[PDB]
Design a protein around this ligand. Structure first.
Ligand SMILES: C[C@@H]1CC[C@@]2(OC1)O[C@H]1C[C@H]3[C@@H]4CC=C5C[C@@H](OCCC(CO[C@H]6O[C@H](CO)[C@@H](O[C@H]7O[C@H](CO)[C@@H](O)[C@H](O)[C@H]7O)[C@H](O)[C@H]6O)CO[C@H]6O[C@H](CO)[C@@H](O[C@H]7O[C@H](CO)[C@@H](O)[C@H](O)[C@H]7O)[C@H](O)[C@H]6O)CC[C@]5(C)[C@H]4CC[C@]3(C)[C@H]1[C@@H]2C
Ligand SMILES: CCCCCCCCCCCCCCCCCCCCCCCCCCC(=O)N[C@@H](CO)[C@H](O)[C@H](O)CCCCCCCCCCCCCC
Lengths: 177, 60, 555
């Protein structure tokens, strides 16, 4: 071939996305992303509190016990955030030629900068929510263990210095480079 | 200086003049425009989800 | 019925058509002359913001839209396949486009598609004629009937009112057709060139102020096929993030390294220049062969000007090069119409390459490049469009030459200055009145584009549809073209409109905005630091006299 533009799907237990070449990196990422730029804007940090409050009020309008209400709201918030950020890979609109087809929205924030204030806030919020919520179901150990497992496994491990550009082939042969 | 242009009379100005509900109309506009309804199709049943007014109407 | 009808032209007397195309001035008091800034730098612009609940409502609406769209897509494409035969593999062949790459157009814009792609007819002057259509299903297909109605024009690129069928330009075009046929032989290298091309090139070079100039047939091709002539993989390009797609395509085709700096931030530009000079090429740290800076004259999306003297200072002191686009600034800005150079007083020799487009202010189609002598002589041999594409036809050349001569003053005396004064006064009056009513208006004091912000997504179709019933034509833009929070309506002013039309538009817009609750001013628009919620009659009575003073504009 005269261009050699192909996508690899190497299979291994632990694998990482290869570093971009000169043409793909220094030239095909020049314009604003329009997908991870709205994070550092007006009213982008208070909306999470509003979502949490609305979910809590909606669940309380049913008239259930505090333990079930708080467990359900924590699980729903964490699952929704995971579905929005960590699951999907790509961009809803063509960028240049498909340059961002191997990365999630979390990796694209702030041009792949590891530590920025918004990331710190996003990591801080689930811990504070868990600390506030545990006080209602301390008696039940099963629910405490379930909440701890959900928080640690979904809302903590992905947002780490490790597990950056990390892919596992157990649920499907992932594509790297 | 004459041009072949038709001028639409303005409401509240030579339309309702020569030719309680205002509060209801204003409330309806405030409820509709500030919510996401126009870019929805067939989703007029989403207003049924806003039955929380009935739930909070009953006290004690 | 489904197909677009062909409309037979109407029979009207000459005076009525002339009034329809170009208005007649009522009083000589509706003109303003533009001054030149000698040594006053541009202050940092100030923007205004609405309260928080607007942003929160916008975010909630977008979240609901995205969730419902994805749920509908999944359920529909899982539970049935007969209807979605254009997004699935057939006989071992992949579909034309992909599901995920066209989510927004299919799921959000399609429901308000009726606000885009509106067919018209006739000359696009003061009043534009539109064909009536009936929406079926959800903006899927339309049915047309043989009925046309006039509408006021605020959506066309006609700044000096040169889009007329009666005048010197039309006679010149007809005479050119009589002399030269509409045939173009081929590329300018082989047979295409004639004497009229040389006349136009020399006239353009004299008008702009440089030594030599070249003409082209398309504005897009001027940028898309220029940078590969003198750039390669060992050069750096610094460009503003708000740049046209043609420049990006040209740089991509060239292959040079691209780095962008934030709009209106000179300190970051200086830091980037220093870091790139020190560091050098990637993986080798060798010095760059050359550095080029790209910028635009007037940005259409916000109506703001670029700081030219600061860029000249940086390019001189760090030994860089400069490139300036003037598609929206030529023929409409400055005391005479030369461009931003007359606004700032900067000599045109400092800028290396200048560019422009005939269509926005002269009523034709084409483009030009202006530079020194040896640069032009080398680029003529090194260019691709000259010896591979077609040539510029004769009627367009005649129209452009007539318009440029009229604006310069060689023929039809006392017309160009009057048009420039009209457009300046109209823009200033509209901007000041809109700010006094209580709205949010962006841009510099004298800019033909007036952007009005409409934040909530559901408030765009309502405004566009309500304005149509009142016979006013508007253009609205939204995400992803604009940021998520900020959606706006763009106003394009002309020299053919009259103060009565402005008053009519102001009354109707004020009433519609009061109905839709679009007034959110935080007091930073007023120069005295107070909220402005006036009446329409007071604005109409007081603004025309007080608009000439420059103390009423924050920027
Ligand atoms: C409380 C209640 C509980 C219950 C519940 O609600 C809440 O719980 C909820 C749990 C929900 C799901 C949760 C999360 C997702 C994923 C999301 O994802 C983005 C949208 C789609 C695309 O995503 C891809 O976007 C990129 C482009 O595709 C991928 O890019 C690469 O691949 C490119 C490939 O060209 C290459 O260019 C490169 O290699 C590279 O670019 C990228 O990897 C990946 O992100 C999702 O996948 C698509 O997959 C197919 C297309 O691939 C579509 O067609 C298929 O449809 C049929 C089935 O197979 C067959 O008939 C067709 O033949 C067959 O083709 C299918 O319709 C569609 O789903 C779409 C929504 C969904 C499914 C939700 C639905 C609703 C629930 C089931 C709810 C549920 C109701
Ligand atoms: C009754 C009660 C149930 C309530 C359900 C809602 C649950 C709410 C709580 C969870 C949500 C997290 C809260 C924070 C979000 C605040 C609002 C921000 C809005 C931003 C919208 C603009 C973003 C544009 C960029 C587009 C983008 O991202 N593209 C892809 C990647 O490039 C992403 O893959 C994509 O978008 C996500 C896929 C769409 C939704 C997937 C799920 C399908 C619907 C099912 C919903 C399940 C419920 C949990 C979400």
């Amino acid at each position: 071939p005269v261009t050699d533009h192909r996508r690899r799907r190497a299979a291994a237990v632990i694998s990482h996305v290869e570093q971009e070449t000169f043409e793909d990196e220094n030239d095909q990422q020049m314009l604003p992303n329009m997908n991870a730029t709205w994070v550092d804007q007006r009213g982008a940090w208070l909306i999470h509190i509003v979502v949490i409050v609305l979910l809590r009020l909606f669940y309380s309008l049913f008239g259930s016990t505090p333990k079930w209400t708080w467990t359900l709201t924590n699980m729903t918030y964490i699952i929704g955030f995971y579905i929005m950020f960590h699951l999907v890979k790509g961009t809803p609109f063509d960028f240049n030629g498909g340059a961002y087809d191997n990365l999630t929205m979390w990796e694209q924030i702030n041009d792949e900068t590891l530590y920025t204030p918004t990331r710190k806030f996003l990591l801080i919020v689930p811990i504070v929510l868990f600390l506030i919520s545990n006080q209602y179901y301390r008696n039940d150990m099963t629910l405490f263990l379930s909440n701890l497992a959900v928080t640690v496994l979904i809302g903590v491990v992905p947002k780490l210095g490790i597990t950056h550009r990390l892919r596992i082939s157990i649920p499907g042969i992932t594509g790297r480079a | 200086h004459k041009s072949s242009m038709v001028y639409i009379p303005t409401t509240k100005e030579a339309k309702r003049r020569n030719g309680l509900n205002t509060i209801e109309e204003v409330v309806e506009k405030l409820y509709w425009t500030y919510y996401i309804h126009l870019p929805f199709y067939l989703m007029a049943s989403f207003d049924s989800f806003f039955l929380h007014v009935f739930f909070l109407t009953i006290f004690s | 019925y489904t197909r677009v009808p062909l409309c037979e032209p109407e029979e009207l007397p000459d005076d009525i058509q002339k009034e329809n195309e170009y208005g007649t001035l009522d009083s000589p008091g509706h003109l303003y002359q533009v001054k030149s800034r000698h040594g006053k730098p541009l202050p940092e612009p100030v923007v205004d913001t609405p309260p928080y609940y607007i942003s929160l409502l916008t975010y909630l609406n977008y979240l609901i839209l995205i969730i419902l769209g994805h749920v509908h897509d999944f359920l529909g494409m899982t539970f049935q396949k007969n209807k979605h035969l254009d997004l699935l593999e057939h006989d071992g062949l992949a579909p034309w486009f992909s599901n995920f790459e066209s989510f927004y157009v299919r799921r959000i814009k399609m429901r308000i598609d009726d606000c885009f792609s509106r067919p018209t007819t006739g000359v696009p002057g003061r009043f534009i004629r539109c064909i009536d259509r009936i929406s079926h299903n959800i903006n899927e297909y339309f049915t047309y009937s043989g009925a046309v109605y006039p509408c006021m024009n605020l959506s066309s690129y006609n700044y000096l009112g040169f889009a007329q069928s009666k005048g010197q330009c039309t006679d010149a075009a007809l005479e050119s057709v009589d002399k030269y046929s509409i045939q173009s032989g081929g590329p300018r290298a082989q047979i295409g060139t004639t004497d009229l091309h040389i006349k136009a090139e020399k006239l353009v070079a004299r008008f702009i102020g440089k030594e030599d100039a070249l003409v082209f047939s398309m504005g897009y091709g001027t940028n898309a096929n220029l940078f590969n002539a003198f750039l390669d993989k060992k050069c750096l390009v610094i460009s503003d993030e708000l740049n046209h797609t043609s420049i990006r395509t040209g740089v991509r085709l060239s292959g040079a390294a691209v780095r962008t700096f934030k709009h209106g931030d000179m300190v970051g530009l200086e830091k980037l220049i220093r870091e790139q000079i020190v560091l050098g090429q990637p993986k080798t740290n060798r010095p760059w062969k050359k550095i080029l800076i790209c910028a635009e004259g007037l940005f259409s999306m916000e109506g703001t000007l670029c700081n030219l003297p600061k860029l000249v200072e940086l390019k001189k002191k760090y030994k860089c090069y400069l490139f300036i686009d003037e598609a929206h600034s030529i023929g409409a800005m400055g005391p005479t119409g030369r461009g931003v150079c007359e606004i700032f007083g900067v000599d045109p020799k400092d800028v290396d390459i200048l560019m422009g487009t005939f269509t926005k202010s002269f009523g034709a189609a084409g483009g030009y490049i202006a530079a020194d002598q040896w640069i032009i002589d080398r680029l003529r041999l090194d260019l691709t469009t000259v010896s591979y594409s077609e040539s510029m036809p004769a009627p367009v050349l005649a129209q452009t030459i007539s318009s440029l001569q009229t604006i310069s003053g060689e023929i039809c005396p006392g017309q160009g200055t009057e048009r420039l004064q009209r457009i300046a006064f109209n823009s200033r009056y509209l901007r000041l009145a809109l700010q006094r009513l209580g709205f949010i208006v962006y841009g510099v004091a004298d800019s033909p584009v007036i952007p009005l912000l409409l934040y909530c997504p559901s408030k765009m179709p309502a405004f566009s549809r309500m304005m149509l019933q009142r016979r006013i034509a508007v253009v609205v833009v939204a995400y992803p073209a604009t940021p998520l929070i900020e959606s706006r309506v763009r106003f394009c002013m002309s020299a053919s409109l009259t103060k009565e039309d402005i008053d009519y538009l102001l009354r109707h817009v004020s009433e519609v905005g009061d109905k839709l609750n679009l007034k959110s001013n935080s007091g930073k628009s007023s120069y005295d630091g107070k909220r402005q919620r006036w009446d329409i009659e007071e604005v109409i009575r007081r603004t025309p006299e007080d608009c000439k003073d420059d103390k009423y504009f924050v920027n």
